[PDB]
């Protein structure tokens, strides 16, 4: 209501050598009162990458904003899925975020994979938040071995949340999956009443034991 | 008071091929009434690894069950986990975490390392990364505070290093706040690059835990090392 943030990327797909993404940042204040805020632009990626694109700027809307900022994604950074985040904090403490994705070295609109073993992990019903009094979110997990041979995989899930919490969601499992078979399950987490308010990254990890390659899938759930 | 948690590891140093870590978990109810809680053991690692201590032979089906301690009593429990070779070398943090029924969070942490020495600075093949909370300031008031951090990159290699460096603060409500913009530096052999950089936590920023995350890249080798430090806004 007091702030609306908009984010647009000119490109959503880079090759493995990386490249350049230009972003259009739009911030409007439709409310009746004038408004003070700080904003910035950051990126999150595979293998724990976080990096800034645009530094913290204070803005008094008395003294709609439109800016374009770009950044280089270099080749050394890991191939996979990245999230760009325009973040605004209003003086009153309200947080507004506009997010967009790009990929590096993999196809957008293709499942993440480990050389032919695809990882389809989803928030089953698109449930992005639960009440402070608690709620339960199931996730579907489908590991499809499209290889000619066996896949020897390990799989687990945690919920990385407020107050330094890392809540187990799926214990470590190992499966030898034959050519053409699919390991399939539904796994949910109950956000108990007692868990703290805030943002939880439901973080799934899948490893090929033989190649040693890991892919993560990360999904957000807010406890209100 | 309601809970005191503690954790000890049987070892803190693994080689690159990995190994097995056993741990003793201690949860004491120091308070005067009975306390109901949930607890678990989780590991945080390099390259974004997070994983639970628990491994199961088949399909994990359990849910996170509560336990209860009578006033003055304690739970002594014991847990073990394998660290595979494929997990990245570097520093790992094991965390005993307890959430009480009333919402209070208690934690006890210990570190182990894999394929690098204990008490040695993180490095990229001779280039040494020494980043610290300068004045040991672990929290700030909800009305705001500033925290400076020292950065020292000592190049012990025979040749020059091309590094890229940046810092963010990874916080509550999905915030990733720039602390130090991406810079590239050329550090001669035997040199140290030194700077000081602080973050202002504005009043408006959300309460909770902020991970000050410094990243350093060897632009030539393409290897990256992280350093992270926590600061809580009350
Ligand atoms: Na095996």
Cβ contacts below 8 Å, chain A against chain B, sum to 170
C-alpha to C-alpha distance for B77 and B65, rounded to whole angstroms: 15
**Distance of CA A150 from the midpoint of ligand 1 (Å):** 11
Closest chain B C-alpha to A110 CA, distance in angstroms: 22
End-to-end CA distance of chain A: give it in Å, rounded: 18
Contacts of B56 in chain A (CB under 8 A): 171-173
Using alpha carbons, select from B213, B170, B178 the residue that is nearest to residue B46: B213
For A36-58, the DSSP string reads EEEEEEEEE-GGG-EEEEEEEEE
Indicate the residue of B84, B175, B204 with minimum beta-carbon distance to A91.
B204
Indicate the residue of B59, B86, B202 with minimum beta-carbon distance to A38.
B202
- CB contact set of A43 (below 8 Å; sequence gap of 6+): A49, A50, A51, A52, A53, A71, A82, A83, A84, A85, B176
Burial class (CB in 10 A: 0-12, 13-18, 19+), B56: middle
**CB–CB of A55 and B105 under 8 A?**
no
**CB–CB of A166 and B97 under 8 A?**
yes
What backbone phi and psi angles, to 5 degrees, belong to B134? -60, -45
The DSSP letter of residue B190 is: T
**CB–CB of A163 and B105 under 8 A?**
yes
- Domain B122-234 class, CATH top level: mainly beta
Q: Give me the resolution in angstroms, 1 decimal.
A: 2.5
Resolved by: X-ray
C-alpha to C-alpha distance for A142 and A134, rounded to whole angstroms: 27
Q: Which of A164, A189, A201 to mutate to test the interface with B (most CBs of B within 10 A)?
A: A164
**CB–CB of A212 and B85 under 8 A?**
yes
Residues paired with residue B140 on neighbouring β-strands, in sequence order: B233
C-alpha to C-alpha distance for B25 and B109, rounded to whole angstroms: 10
Do A206 and A152 form a contact (C-beta atoms < 8 A)?
no
A112-224 CATH fold: Immunoglobulin-like (2.60.40)
End-to-end CA distance of chain B: give it in Å, rounded: 19
Please give the residue of chain B at the shortest CA–CA distance from A99: B174
Indicate the residue of B56, B105, B178 with minimum beta-carbon distance to A171.
B56
Contacts of A44 in chain B (CB under 8 A): 176
Helices (H), chain A: none
**Distance of CA B13 from the midpoint of ligand 1 (Å):** 24
With b meaning 16 or more CB within 10 Å and e meaning fewer, what string describes B7-31?
Answer: beeeeeebeeebbebebebebbbee
Using alpha carbons, select from A191, A189, A164, A196 the residue that is nearest to residue B102: A196
Using alpha carbons, select from B173, B175, B92, B169 the residue that is nearest to residue B133: B169
**Distance of CA A32 from the midpoint of ligand 1 (Å):** 63
- Domain A1-111 class, CATH top level: mainly beta
What backbone phi and psi angles, to 5 degrees, belong to A24? -105, 115
What is B1-121's CATH number?
2.60.40.3880
Contacts of B224 in chain A (CB under 8 A): 49, 76
Do A133 and A193 form a contact (C-beta atoms < 8 A)?
yes
**CB–CB of A49 and B51 under 8 A?**
no
Closest chain A C-alpha to B77 CA, distance in angstroms: 17
**Distance of CA A171 from the midpoint of ligand 1 (Å):** 17
C-alpha to C-alpha distance for B202 and A220, rounded to whole angstroms: 25
**CB–CB of A93 and B206 under 8 A?**
yes
C-alpha to C-alpha distance for B125 and B157, rounded to whole angstroms: 8
Pairing type for strands B13-14 and B19-28 reads unpaired
Please give the residue of chain A at the shortest CA–CA distance from B57: A173
Q: Where are the domains of chain B?
A: 1-121, 122-234
Tell me if domain B1-121 and domain B122-234 are identical in fold.
yes
């Amino acid at each position: 209501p007091v702030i609306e943030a908009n984010l647009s990327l000119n490109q959503n797909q880079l090759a493995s050598n990386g490249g350049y993404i230009s972003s259009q940042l739009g911030i409007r204040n439709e409310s009746c009162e004038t408004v003070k805020f700080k904003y910035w632009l950051s990126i999150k990626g595979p293998e724990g990458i976080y990096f800034p694109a645009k530094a913290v700027v204070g803005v008094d809307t008395a003294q709609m904003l439109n800016v374009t900022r770009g950044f280089w994604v270099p080749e050394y950074m890991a191939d996979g899925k990245y999230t760009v985040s325009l973040q605004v904090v209003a003086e009153n403490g309200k947080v507004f975020k506009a997010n967009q994705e790009f990929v590096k070295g993999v196809d957008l609109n293709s499942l993440p994979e480990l050389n032919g073993l695809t990882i389809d992990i989803k928030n089953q019903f698109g449930i992005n938040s639960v009440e402070s009094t608690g709620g339960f979110v199931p996730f579907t997990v489908d590991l499809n071995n499209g290889r000619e041979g066996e896949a020897n995989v390990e799989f687990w899930m945690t919920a990385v949340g407020p107050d330094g919490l890392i809540i187990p969601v799926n214990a470590r499992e190992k499966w030898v999956i034959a050519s053409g078979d699919t390991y399939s399950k539904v796994r949910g987490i109950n956000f108990d009443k007692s868990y703290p308010a805030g943002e939880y990254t439901i973080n799934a990890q899948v490893v090929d034991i033989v190649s040693g390659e890991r892919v993560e899938q990360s999904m957000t759930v807010v406890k209100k």
